[PDB]
């Protein structure tokens, strides 16, 4: 009869940057997503595989909550099947996804008048990303032929290039906080329902 | 909202003594707590930022510690200048809030 910590992960101060997204396990509480859907602040609320009005009467097994910060035109890639420099180098969703994707327009918080460049994002990798797999490793990515000693310079670039968030920077480039839940409904008894 | 109990409600110290304060939170806030001192009816000031670091100008006898839910502000070798009232205040979830405070007087 204790209500879930959707209070904690939503109105938090600093969301972690997208190259290292925090994974909050939520279990053994009662959920109420009517305080999530009926609040008209969320610009994007897409649920794949569950209907959004049907979100209440569903006994889950465990509900996770990924959360990060991305720019405006790259919130389209947080969905099963797309590609780009977010969805395969930073955060990859499987193509059997059974959760919901919630967004914002947090231009009020994560945007300084100079550069609020504390939200890093990955840009280069040797391969693509697995479904639901983060990579905090900051390795000097080569691009040509030489192995370059762990030294920056020619053909050896730092992978995490940062963002830049001015308050007058354009709607497709404004910082969008994203929290994406991932449900699960099998191979366990009922834990989360309300 | 996160309530921040502090223990005890008021202390009693002598100069040359070391007493450790405490600001037990309610949730699990990951070192997002700061500590404020405030004397009688004026503007408060900072002592430690993010519960372990230190700001400029202040003495180096204000050492903060602790992480997770329990926090301690260790005052060491306290002079007459550190009479006052002390506050703790989180910064992790919204809305931000200061604490109920411990009043530090002199014997």
């Amino acid at each position: 009869t204790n209500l879930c910590p959707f209070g904690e992960v939503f109105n938090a101060t600093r969301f972690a940057s997208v190259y290292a997204w925090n994974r909050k396990r939520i279990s053994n509480c009662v959920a109420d997503y009517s305080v999530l859907y009926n609040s008209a602040s969320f610009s994007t609320f897409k649920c794949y595989g569950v209907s959004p009005t049907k979100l209440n009467d569903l006994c889950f097994t465990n509900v996770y909550a990924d959360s990060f910060v991305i720019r405006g035109d790259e919130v389209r890639q947080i969905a099963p099947g797309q590609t780009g420099k977010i969805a395969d180098y930073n955060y990859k969703l499987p193509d059997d996804f059974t959760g919901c994707v919630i967004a914002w327009n947090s231009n009020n918080l994560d945007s300084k008048v100079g550069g609020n460049y504390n939200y890093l994002y990955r840009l280069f990798r040797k391969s693509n990303l697995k479904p639901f797999e983060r990579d905090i490793s900051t390795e000097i990515y080569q691009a040509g032929s030489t192995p370059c000693n762990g030294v920056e310079g020619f053909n050896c670039y730092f992978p995490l290039q940062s963002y830049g968030f001015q308050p007058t920077n354009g709607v497709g480039y404004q910082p969008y906080r994203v929290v994406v839940l991932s449900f699960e409904l099998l191979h366990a008894p009922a834990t989360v329902c309300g | 909202d996160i309530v921040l109990t502090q223990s005890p409600a008021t202390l009693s110290v002598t100069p040359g003594d070391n007493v450790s304060l405490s600001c037990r939170a309610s949730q699990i806030i990951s070192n997002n707590l700061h500590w404020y001192q405030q004397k009688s009816h004026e503007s408060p000031r900072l002592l430690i930022k993010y519960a372990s670091q230190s700001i400029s100008g202040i003495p180096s006898r204000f050492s903060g510690s602790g992480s997770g839910t329990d926090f301690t502000l260790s005052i060491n070798s306290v002079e007459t200048e550190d009479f006052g009232m002390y506050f703790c205040q989180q910064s992790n979830t919204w809305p931000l809030t200061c604490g109920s405070g411990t009043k530090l007087e002199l014997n």
């Epitope: 600093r14 609020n116 | 700061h34 404020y36 900072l46 993010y50 205040q89 910064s91």
Partner: nanobody, 119 residues
């Protein structure tokens, strides 16, 4: 010189509107926010709410949801705090404090304006 100086103590009647000031200079005003703090006599501090110092968009502690408004004049650097429908509840000192747009610890404070209400 980084300091936040304010206006004087106010004496109003229940049913009036007051407007207290908070004017800052010495730093670049757009690099940080502004957090207003209400201190009752003998209690802790309650963060009233933060206002962004670039667009004038307020955000309230939802305990203080109505009757309060954080104005902002940008050229003449000032954040106002308007209080509608003054009651016997609302007597307290009212600071203003500069807590950043990324950190949120109130380092630079102000002298505080004691607003007192009685008939």
């Amino acid at each position: 010189q980084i300091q936040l100086v304010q206006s004087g103590p106010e004496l109003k009647k229940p049913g009036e509107t007051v407007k207290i000031s908070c004017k800052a200079s010495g730093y670049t005003f757009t690099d940080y926010g502004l957090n207003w703090v209400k201190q009752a006599p003998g209690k802790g501090l309650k963060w009233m709410g933060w206002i962004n110092t670039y667009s004038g968009e307020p955000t309230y502690n939802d305990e203080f949801r109505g009757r309060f408004a954080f104005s902002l004049e940008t050229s003449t650097i000032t954040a106002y705090l308007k209080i509608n429908n003054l009651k016997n509840e609302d007597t307290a000192t009212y600071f203003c404090a500069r807590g950043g747009n990324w950190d949120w610890y109130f380092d630079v404070w102000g002298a505080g304006t004691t607003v007192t209400v009685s008939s």
